[PDB]
Design a protein around this ligand. Structure first.
Ligand SMILES: [Mn+2]
Ligand SMILES: [Mn+2]
Lengths: 351, 351
């Protein structure tokens, strides 16, 4: 039940929450490999595919990592995280041009700051909402800074327990900004078996004021579609204009075609999800009228004979005086006239 | 939580339940339009597509409907239900040949009896499990007969409230047979908005011993995929060898290609569904090691100076002596030596 709720906030003019259309975040991330030309090509592909939001990563290497980062390699690469981020990072001027380009296509630009310096850059740019990546979910000092900007926060929760996340949510609530929690697994790519969609329920139950979604790094749309069925309001996958691009995140990115498929599926499952079993569906009425059973004579019954389980049965359609629900209530009734085998039992057939 | 359970039973050698691979029932139904040749063509298409189960409908018109049925038209047709069933019904000899053909392809044959006579025919054939359609979900006399055969029952629950279904489940439990409940909406085709996947949860909560699934009549796989994400164990769609076939149910049927897509998606979502947020994923360890923050000097600190929020900050990677969680614990500590701006704070750097 927890995920079926009225929680909502706006990112600019776009309302997100269970009662709204799911929102797909196209995470270009570092997929541009440091090139504004490639980034624009990817923004073009997102726009033409029907995207509403393009998300960036804001990398200021000096403030985001210490020299130790030069000695440590990610699971999906063979060089240091420092080398990757130095290679892919857009400087401030280029990132400002990227935000302008995204907005010139009528889409929303948001980003993930990976540092204090990055957070401050985005505040100067006045972005409408902040994403906090799973690597920074336990970075309470950074979250406190970002929350002070007064914009909604979308918090990815991979690599963190509910217990760890509580401290971040406390900081966010204290700042008085609305927020979303995205369930996430940070393996690039993520196997289906590690997704644990049930994590979304767990988050929603622990944090009843949270908007809930999924950030994903599997190779396809199945996990995100499943998330929508569960009640997810925000979906995030990395995004590329084409799958032959180089880069460590390309492998789990969606492309224009698969984005379009996700948007279509998300809409269908937004419509199909939730609701209640007992809700009466007007469209079924012709089916109920022909398919439901009425009580019929199973033998010729003479006037004055007793109705029973031996001489009554039930058959479609549902327009007879007695429904199958009343079948046993007729036992012991007296035939008021001769009753023909196969005929519906009428109220006038009994005394 | 209700749908995440250990409930199970077998249909022949095939185990069904939340902890098993989802089972897709290929409901040929009346799609053969009364022709054994067409029925065999459809069985061939199901086999070659990878189907495990072919489901029939067993129609003995005299016992399933009274003469009133000649005056009533289904929502998805323009002739009487009587005319449709008389046209499509396979006689006993032909239905026996159909069961043999399905089994000769190594698939399981089950069927839905729409009458007492049909139920008795299937008992003579010794089918491994019985399906009860939504039109018969409130046909308590028929359910009592079928349950007496001692085989598992798969009960569709469209057009019926939880209250109505309780009476059928009582009968089933009394007979001592295991059972599944399929959530269902009986409009042909069903709009996404009428699916109400939440109905599955409602059933599971009301009937905690039930295996739970979805029977569907939408135009595509989205609803069934959503059902798998929720914990569904049995999926049913009508099945045709090709979509250009005539017949009132063809429109919402899956074909070989879309069956294959559903089977693939059902497997992915069987893997991805459920689980817990706090579960530790071994594969994320390299990400945690590079991405998590450690405490660093934010200024040159001279020996004897106090550590504080002004001269400390936090940065990746996660191999420093102090985690971001310990950031505030260092406030007021005394520098045991000169500490260089940007360096990780070490245990030997404090008194
Ligand atoms: Mn990511
Ligand atoms: Mn059906």
């Amino acid at each position: 039940g927890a995920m079926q709720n009225n929680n909502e906030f706006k990112i600019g003019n776009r309302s997100v929450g269970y009662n709204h259309e799911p929102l797909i975040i196209c995470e270009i991330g570092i997929n541009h490999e440091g090139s504004l030309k490639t980034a624009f090509e990817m923004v073009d592909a997102a726009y033409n595919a029907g995207a509403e939001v393009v998300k960036h990563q804001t990398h200021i290497v000096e403030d985001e990592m210490s020299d130790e980062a030069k000695q440590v390699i990610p699971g999906n690469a063979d060089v240091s995280i420092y080398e990757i981020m130095e290679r892919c990072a857009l400087n401030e001027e280029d990132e400002i041009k990227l935000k302008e380009y995204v907005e010139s296509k009528g889409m929303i630009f948001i980003s993930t700051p990976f540092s204090r310096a990055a957070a401050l850059r985005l505040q100067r740019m006045d972005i409408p909402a902040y994403k906090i990546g799973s690597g920074e979910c336990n970075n309470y000092p950074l979250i406190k800074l970002v929350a002070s900007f007064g914009k909604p926060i979308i918090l990815s929760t991979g690599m963190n327990s509910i217990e760890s996340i509580k401290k971040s949510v406390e900081i966010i609530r204290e700042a008085g900004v609305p927020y979303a929690l995205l369930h996430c697994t940070n393996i690039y790519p993520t196997p289906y078996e590690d997704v644990r969609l049930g994590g979304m329920n767990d988050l929603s139950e622990a944090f009843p004021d949270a908007i809930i979604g999924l950030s994903d790094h599997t190779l396809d749309n199945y996990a995100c579609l499943g998330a929508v069925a569960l009640g997810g309001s925000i979906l995030e996958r990395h995004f590329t204009d084409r799958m032959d691009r180089p880069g460590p995140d390309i492998v789990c990115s969606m492309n224009p075609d698969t984005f379009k498929e996700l948007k279509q599926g998300a809409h269908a499952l937004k419509l199909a999800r939730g609701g209640k079993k007992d809700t009466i569906i007007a469209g079924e009425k012709p089916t109920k009228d022909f398919a439901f059973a009425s009580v019929v004579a199973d033998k010729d019954i003479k006037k004055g004979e007793l109705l029973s389980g031996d001489n009554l049965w039930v058959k479609a359609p549902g327009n007879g005086d007695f429904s199958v629900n009343e079948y046993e209530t007729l036992f012991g009734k007296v035939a008021a006239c001769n009753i023909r085998k196969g005929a519906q039992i009428k109220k006038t057939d009994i005394e």
